[PDB]
Amino acid sequence: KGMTPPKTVNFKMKGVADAAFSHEFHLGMYKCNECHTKLFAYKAGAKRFTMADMDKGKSCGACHNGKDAFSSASDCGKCHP
């Protein structure tokens, strides 16, 4: 609650399995300001992005571009368990 990062943030959607983001994992390499507010709001579901947006470097795609981290264009299961 509040400004505390949830261990896991879920993204609901139809068709594909919901996506999941782990603060626990990412906090092992990044500080809050490396993602907030430039990439994400300090509020879940405030702004929704698509896989296409990620392909353009937005949302998860800002890092999951095949160079900084595994591409968001593949490995669907990694983020949609």
Binding residue positions for heme c = 23, 26, 32, 35-36, 44-45, 48-49, 51, 60, 63-64, 70, 76, 79-80
- Residues 9-48 touching ligand HEC, rule: CB under 6 A, are 9, 11, 13, 15-16, 19, 21, 23, 25-27, 29-30, 32, 34-36, 39-40, 42-45, 48
Tell me if 7 contacts ligand HEC by CB under 6 A. Answer: no
Extended beta strands in the chain, E state: 8-11, 19-22
